Scaffold this active site. Structure first.
Site, mmCIF file in Angstrom:
data_model
loop_
_atom_site.group_PDB
_atom_site.id
_atom_site.type_symbol
_atom_site.label_atom_id
_atom_site.label_comp_id
_atom_site.label_asym_id
_atom_site.label_seq_id
_atom_site.Cartn_x
_atom_site.Cartn_y
_atom_site.Cartn_z
ATOM 1 N N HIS A 45 0.861 -1.215 0.000
ATOM 2 C CA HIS A 45 0.000 0.000 0.000
ATOM 3 C C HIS A 45 0.888 1.252 0.000
ATOM 4 O O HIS A 45 0.353 2.371 -0.112
ATOM 5 C CB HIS A 45 -1.013 -0.010 1.149
ATOM 6 C CG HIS A 45 -0.452 0.249 2.502
ATOM 7 N ND1 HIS A 45 -0.159 -0.763 3.390
ATOM 8 C CD2 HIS A 45 -0.164 1.390 3.133
ATOM 9 C CE1 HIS A 45 0.306 -0.237 4.510
ATOM 10 N NE2 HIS A 45 0.308 1.069 4.376
ATOM 11 N N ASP A 89 -0.152 -7.619 1.352
ATOM 12 C CA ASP A 89 0.399 -6.282 1.499
ATOM 13 C C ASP A 89 1.920 -6.329 1.685
ATOM 14 O O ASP A 89 2.475 -6.168 2.786
ATOM 15 C CB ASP A 89 -0.297 -5.565 2.649
ATOM 16 C CG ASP A 89 -0.067 -4.073 2.646
ATOM 17 O OD1 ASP A 89 0.451 -3.552 1.599
ATOM 18 O OD2 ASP A 89 -0.401 -3.466 3.670
ATOM 19 N N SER A 171 3.562 2.332 8.470
ATOM 20 C CA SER A 171 3.266 1.300 7.446
ATOM 21 C C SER A 171 4.551 0.862 6.734
ATOM 22 O O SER A 171 5.388 1.731 6.453
ATOM 23 C CB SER A 171 2.245 1.821 6.458
ATOM 24 O OG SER A 171 1.067 2.256 7.115
HETATM 25 C C1 LIG Z 1 -8.433 -3.610 5.044
HETATM 26 N N1 LIG Z 1 -8.616 -2.796 6.260
HETATM 27 C C2 LIG Z 1 -9.369 -3.127 7.299
HETATM 28 O O1 LIG Z 1 -10.027 -4.157 7.407
HETATM 29 O O2 LIG Z 1 -9.306 -2.149 8.241
HETATM 30 C C3 LIG Z 1 -8.477 -1.195 7.732
HETATM 31 C C4 LIG Z 1 -8.044 0.017 8.235
HETATM 32 C C5 LIG Z 1 -7.182 0.811 7.497
HETATM 33 N N2 LIG Z 1 -6.781 2.020 8.058
HETATM 34 C C6 LIG Z 1 -7.690 3.072 8.095
HETATM 35 C C7 LIG Z 1 -7.335 4.285 8.661
HETATM 36 C C8 LIG Z 1 -8.364 5.424 8.663
HETATM 37 O O3 LIG Z 1 -9.537 5.123 8.381
HETATM 38 O O4 LIG Z 1 -7.985 6.591 8.898
HETATM 39 C C9 LIG Z 1 -6.063 4.438 9.203
HETATM 40 O O5 LIG Z 1 -5.721 5.497 9.716
HETATM 41 N N3 LIG Z 1 -5.142 3.390 9.183
HETATM 42 C C10 LIG Z 1 -3.813 3.653 9.776
HETATM 43 C C11 LIG Z 1 -2.688 3.327 8.768
HETATM 44 C C12 LIG Z 1 -1.766 2.324 9.459
HETATM 45 C C13 LIG Z 1 -2.419 2.014 10.803
HETATM 46 C C14 LIG Z 1 -3.579 2.750 10.990
HETATM 47 C C15 LIG Z 1 -4.300 2.599 12.162
HETATM 48 C C16 LIG Z 1 -3.866 1.713 13.138
HETATM 49 C C17 LIG Z 1 -2.707 0.974 12.940
HETATM 50 C C18 LIG Z 1 -1.979 1.126 11.769
HETATM 51 C C19 LIG Z 1 -0.698 0.321 11.537
HETATM 52 F F1 LIG Z 1 0.331 1.147 11.402
HETATM 53 F F2 LIG Z 1 -0.483 -0.485 12.567
HETATM 54 F F3 LIG Z 1 -0.824 -0.393 10.429
HETATM 55 C C20 LIG Z 1 -5.503 2.164 8.606
HETATM 56 O O6 LIG Z 1 -4.725 1.215 8.574
HETATM 57 C C21 LIG Z 1 -6.749 0.397 6.243
HETATM 58 C C22 LIG Z 1 -7.185 -0.823 5.734
HETATM 59 C C23 LIG Z 1 -8.047 -1.616 6.479
#
Ligand SMILES: Cn1c(=O)oc2cc(-n3cc(C(=O)O)c(=O)n([C@@H]4CCc5c4cccc5C(F)(F)F)c3=O)ccc21
Ligand SMILES: *[C@@H]1O[C@H](CO)[C@@H](O[C@@H]2O[C@H](CO)[C@@H](O[C@@H]3O[C@H](CO[C@H]4O[C@H](CO)[C@@H](O)[C@H](O)[C@@H]4O)[C@@H](O)[C@H](O)[C@@H]3O)[C@H](O)[C@H]2NC(C)=O)[C@H](O)[C@H]1NC(C)=O
Ligand SMILES: *[C@@H]1O[C@H](CO)[C@@H](O[C@@H]2O[C@H](CO)[C@@H](O)[C@H](O)[C@H]2NC(C)=O)[C@H](O)[C@H]1NC(C)=O
Ligand SMILES: [Zn+2]
Length: 215
Positions: A45, A89, A171
């Protein structure tokens, strides 16, 4: 990284800071790690029109002699990567030349560690400095609410009773368990409530090897 500590500078010499270019938006940022002198492993991503890698960084705002800024010539996104579910990913970046080996730059139920320059809170900016946090590997049931999570493909990371977490900007970074990379930061909840989902590297090891041998 939420709830972590500043790394001892250069203590994680495989860490890569990625600046990703998109044709229709400003730069985005991700982590990654140097697995060969001319290859960085990260999250699919984190793909973009073009990517620059910075090795040797601690405080990413202040250029120092440890820095090696390197052009990526090619992005190898996993061919089954799914932009909706974030299945598969994982992505390899081939660097234009091999990095120099220095003290600050080199290749790479239990508790694991993750590092990154990501935000230190939901409303906070990305960290100037590399941060690290220790997180618990969870049973896959802990990640059931991620409806497309798959225990064979992915790790479930972070005790829900703690705030400690990777977040936006982290990420692509590695999760190390006993000093060996086992996960890649993939996704989690917008409210930063653990746990989060990491790519399970072991599953992809054949594909990793295939790319490296052809390139
Ligand atoms: C596929 N999928 C899913 O099932 O749940 C989903 C969540 C999202 N999603 C959304 C976000 C938003 O809406 O702002 C958002 O901020 N993030 C951030 C980006 C990385 C991250 C986030 C939050 C917590 C933890 C992490 C990590 F770093 F541990 F990976 C996110 O990953 C991205 C796809 C998915
Ligand atoms: C990325 O992953 C996506 C999510 O899995 C992929 O979308 C899925 O793709 C499959 C085909 O590979 C579709 O399978 C079909 O499903 C229909 C039933 O669809 C309806 O019911 C489900 C709920 O049961 C609902 O989610 C749908 O929206 C529909 O209301 C079957 O009748 C077919 O025989 C076949 O099995 C999925 O429907 C589809 N899901 C979604 C949510 O779009 C996507 O293709 C992947 N992308 C890439 C490029 O890999
Ligand atoms: C990382 O490096 C930057 C750039 O040197 C530091 O930023 C300075 O921080 C002080 C206050 O701490 C400000 O008054 C300066 O104006 C900043 N300079 C610039 C050009 O931004 C930053 O403190 C360093 N961060 C660390 C070590 O945590
Ligand atoms: Zn330094």
């Amino acid at each position: 990284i939420i709830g972590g500590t500043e790394c001892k500078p250069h203590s994680r010499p495989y860490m890569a800071y990625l600046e990703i270019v998109t044709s229709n938006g400003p730069s985005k940022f991700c982590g990654g790690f140097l697995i060969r002198r001319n290859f960085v492993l990260t999250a699919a991503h984190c793909a973009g029109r073009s990517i620059t890698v910075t090795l040797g960084a601690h405080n990413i705002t202040e250029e120092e002699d440890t820095w090696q800024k390197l052009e990526v010539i090619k992005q190898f996104r996993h061919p089954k990567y799914n932009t909706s579910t974030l299945h598969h990913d994982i992505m390899l970046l081939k660097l234009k030349e091999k990095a120099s080996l220095t003290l600050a730059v080199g290749t790479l139920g239990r508790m694991c560690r993750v590092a990154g320059w990501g935000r230190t809170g939901v409303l906070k900016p990305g960290s100037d400095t590399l941060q690290e946090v220790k997180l618990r590997l969870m049973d896959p049931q802990a990640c059931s609410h991620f409806r497309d999570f798959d225990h064979n493909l992915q790790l479930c990371v972070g005790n829900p009773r703690k705030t400690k977490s990777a977040f936006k900007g982290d990420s692509g970074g590695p999760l190390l368990c006993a000093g060996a990379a086992q996960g890649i930061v993939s996704y989690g909840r917008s409210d930063a409530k653990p746990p989060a989902v990491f790519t399970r590297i072991s599953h992809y090891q054949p594909w990793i090897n295939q790319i490296l041998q052809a390139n």
